[PDB]
Paper text:
UGGT acts as the gatekeeper in this system because this enzyme is capable of sensing the folding states of glycoproteins as potential substrates. UGGT only transfers monoglucose residues to incompletely folded glycoproteins. UGGT is a large enzyme, comprising approximately 1500 amino acid residues, which has been putatively divided into two regions: an N-terminal folding-sensor region, which accounts for approximately 80% of the enzyme and is not homologous with any known structures, and a C-terminal catalytic domain, which accounts for the remaining 20% of the enzyme and belongs to the glycosyltransferase 8 family. On the other hand, the folding-sensor region of UGGT was found to harbour three tandem Trx-like domains: Trx1 (residues 168–379), Trx2 (residues 467–624) and Trx3 (residues 671–831).
On the other hand, Form 2 of the Trx3 domain of UGGT cocrystallized with a detergent ANAPOE C12E8 belonged to space group C2221 and diffracted up to 1.70-Å resolution. In the crystal structure, one molecule was contained per asymmetric unit. The final model of Form 2 had an Rwork of 20.1% and Rfree of 24.6%. The C-terminal α6 helix, which is followed by a putatively flexible linker region in UGGT, was completely disordered in the crystal structure of Form 2, suggesting the instability of this helix (left). Because of the absence of the α6 helix, an extensive hydrophobic patch was exposed on the surface of the Trx3 domain (centre). The detergent ANAPOE C12E8 was accommodated on this exposed hydrophobic patch. Most of these hydrophobic residues were involved in the interaction with the detergent in Form 2. Thus, the C-terminal α6 helix and detergent molecule occupy the common hydrophobic surface of the Trx3 domain. Although we cannot exclude the possibility that the hydrophobic patch of the Trx3 domain is covered by other domain(s) in intact UGGT, the flexible properties of the C-terminal helix of Trx3 may contribute to regulatory mechanisms underlying the folding-sensing function of this domain. Thus, our crystallographic study provides an atomic view of the potential substrate-binding site of UGGT.
Numbering used by the authors: 672 to 816
The structure:
Amino acid sequence: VNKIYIENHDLMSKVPVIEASKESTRDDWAALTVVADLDDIEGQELVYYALRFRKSNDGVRLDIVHNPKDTSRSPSVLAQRLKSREDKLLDFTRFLDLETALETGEFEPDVAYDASLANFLASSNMKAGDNFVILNGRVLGPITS
Ligand SMILES: CCCCCCCCCCCCOCCOCCOCCOCCOCCCCCOCCOCCO
């Protein structure tokens, strides 16, 4: 059950995270990962829905894995842009706010991060560009077009 979470600590340590509230209960806890291609509106839309879900459900730990189909730009670039605005993620009220968060910010590519992402996909039998979620170890998707 756990294996997806054990084999990918390096990746999962670097992605944007909204932790479960401290004041939330153990029974309200859930672990939701959204894996989506943030180069495209459909992937962005899925993350936006997940942000809205977390805003209203504060026992949820949400983390976000940018999973582009095209890797000409390092997958770590949008990841770092979003990571740099982690404290703002629950202040978003508008889809445009997420778009804006992804649009600018100069970051060196993280070569090790990119390799950890490729490894995560391979070992999870998913493809670059696929949009999916992991809920308490259950992988659901891909969610097609
Ligand atoms: C096409 C797909 C579109 C996707 C939309 C955007 C993606 C985000 C949406 C994903 C949401 C999926 O999950 C929804 C369910 O979660 C709702 C929030 O609730 C989380 C809580 O879940 C807890 C699960 O329950 C397990 C706890 C069991 C506890 C048992 O307690 C008994 C103890 O009692 C005796 C003790 O004295």
